[PDB]
Design an enzyme around this catalytic site. Structure first.
Site, PDB file in Angstrom:
ATOM      1  N   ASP A 127       3.119   3.249   1.493  1.00 24.35           N
ATOM      2  CA  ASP A 127       2.107   4.258   1.178  1.00 24.35           C
ATOM      3  C   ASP A 127       2.332   5.119  -0.094  1.00 24.35           C
ATOM      4  O   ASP A 127       2.723   6.266   0.023  1.00 24.35           O
ATOM      5  CB  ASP A 127       2.050   5.163   2.444  1.00 24.35           C
ATOM      6  CG  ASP A 127       0.930   6.191   2.429  1.00 24.35           C
ATOM      7  OD1 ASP A 127       0.069   6.123   1.537  1.00 24.35           O
ATOM      8  OD2 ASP A 127       0.912   7.072   3.334  1.00 24.35           O
ATOM      9  N   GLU A 163      -4.040  11.192  -3.814  1.00 22.36           N
ATOM     10  CA  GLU A 163      -4.758  10.692  -2.677  1.00 22.36           C
ATOM     11  C   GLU A 163      -4.438  11.562  -1.444  1.00 22.36           C
ATOM     12  O   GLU A 163      -5.328  11.905  -0.649  1.00 22.36           O
ATOM     13  CB  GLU A 163      -4.332   9.262  -2.390  1.00 22.36           C
ATOM     14  CG  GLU A 163      -5.134   8.543  -1.270  1.00 22.36           C
ATOM     15  CD  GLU A 163      -4.612   8.841   0.143  1.00 22.36           C
ATOM     16  OE1 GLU A 163      -3.390   9.128   0.335  1.00 22.36           O
ATOM     17  OE2 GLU A 163      -5.446   8.765   1.079  1.00 22.36           O
ATOM     18  N   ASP A 210      -3.953  -0.015   0.716  1.00 21.43           N
ATOM     19  CA  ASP A 210      -3.105   1.117   1.094  1.00 21.43           C
ATOM     20  C   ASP A 210      -2.444   0.783   2.423  1.00 21.43           C
ATOM     21  O   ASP A 210      -2.958  -0.037   3.188  1.00 21.43           O
ATOM     22  CB  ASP A 210      -3.877   2.443   1.202  1.00 21.43           C
ATOM     23  CG  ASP A 210      -2.940   3.681   1.099  1.00 21.43           C
ATOM     24  OD1 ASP A 210      -1.740   3.488   0.787  1.00 21.43           O
ATOM     25  OD2 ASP A 210      -3.399   4.841   1.311  1.00 21.43           O
TER      26      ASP A 210
HETATM   27 ZN   LIG Z   1      -0.448   8.465   3.289  1.00 13.33          ZN
END
Ligand SMILES: [Zn+2]
Length: 323
Positions: A127, A163, A210
């Site tokens: 991630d 993000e 992701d």
């Molecule tokens: Zn994350």
């Protein structure tokens, strides 16, 4: 008024035969990616940090050394956050900037902020260090074929900043880079000189990666307007498997299973989806067990699974671009 923005609705892939498939499988190196693209990114890299700067230089350097004619742009902006105003920088890598249409691959290079705990540091391996590395390995592996691009359709890579939420997710605290970039692209005429089409109309499909890297990922068919592309992923996975080109893999444990998932997943595709961009979402469901934990590290990555997905992704991209 040209109807070129509708071309994506009818675009069909140019399917690779067995020989070409073996060529692609043999052309990618998981060990090379591991050492040259992934490890340098396994560092603390939340927005504004020294690691964020170093990750950007790494991503930029790895792309600049390739032969294809990548145009690199850094999209820098300020935004309010729970910690006051802060600066963010999305990284956009584009082949043929004036090409009307682009297949877009994306991920986020920031890592979620956590103060050190028990001398452990959060590096967000799945991630999203691995997706970043997969995209860099894809640019590397297909470099020779992409060079030939130097359908008025090309390739674009976006590495989003911010993000992650600084605290826990909230509408205002998360997706800093993508909310910013999506509005910017929606208001930028494309191609240059265009009267009524934007960069967003130019995005054929946003393939967003992701939370990839854990063992046994299962990716659902999230959206009907990209279902026919999810089906190509399945077809590719299946054929690579039948040809003996995947490692430690079985169809019962296949990655792309056609079950739907109706709920919303908060990630960088959202600002684009909500403005009408077709999204093919490569985020597994359920999320890795180590999600948002100090265990989301190198040790818990599944090497052959990443290698397998690299082959699937690269074949998908070549077939999409007719290369
Ligand atoms: Zn994350």
């Amino acid at each position: 008024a040209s109807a070129w923005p509708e071309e994506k609705n009818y675009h069909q892939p140019a399917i690779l035969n067995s020989s070409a498939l073996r060529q692609i499988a043999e052309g990618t190196s998981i060990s090379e990616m591991w050492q040259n693209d992934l490890q340098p990114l396994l560092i603390e890299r939340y927005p504004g940090s020294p690691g964020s700067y170093a990750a950007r230089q790494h991503i930029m350097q790895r792309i600049q050394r390739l032969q294809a004619d990548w145009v690199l742009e850094i999209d820098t902006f300020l935004s309010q956050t729970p910690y006051g105003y802060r600066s963010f920088s999305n990284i956009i890598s584009t082949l043929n900037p004036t090409a009307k249409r682009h297949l877009v691959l994306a991920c986020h290079y920031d890592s979620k902020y956590f103060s050190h705990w028990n001398n452990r540091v959060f590096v967000g391996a799945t991630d999203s260090a691995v997706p970043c590395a997969m995209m860099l390995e894809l640019a590397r592996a297909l470099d020779k074929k992409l060079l030939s691009l130097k359908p008025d359709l090309s390739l674009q890579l976006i590495f989003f900043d911010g993000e992650e939420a600084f605290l826990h997710w909230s509408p205002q605290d998360s997706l800093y880079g993508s909310r910013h970039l999506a509005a910017k692209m929606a208001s930028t005429p494309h191609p240059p000189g265009a009267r009524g089409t934007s960069q967003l109309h130019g995005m054929d499909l946003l393939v967003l990666l992701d939370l990839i890297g854990a063992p046994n990922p299962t990716f659902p068919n999230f959206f009907p307007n990209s279902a026919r592309w999810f089906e190509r992923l399945q077809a590719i996975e299946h054929e690579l498997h039948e040809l003996g080109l995947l490692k430690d893999h079985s169809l019962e444990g296949r990655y792309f299973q056609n079950y739907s998932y109706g709920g919303v997943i908060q990630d960088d595709h959202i600002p684009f989806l909500r403005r009408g961009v077709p999204v093919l979402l490569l985020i597994p469901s359920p999320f890795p067990e180590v999600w948002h934990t100090m265990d989301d590290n190198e040790e818990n990555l599944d090497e052959s699974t990443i290698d397998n997905l690299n082959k699937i992704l690269q074949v998908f991209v070549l077939e999409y671009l007719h290369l």
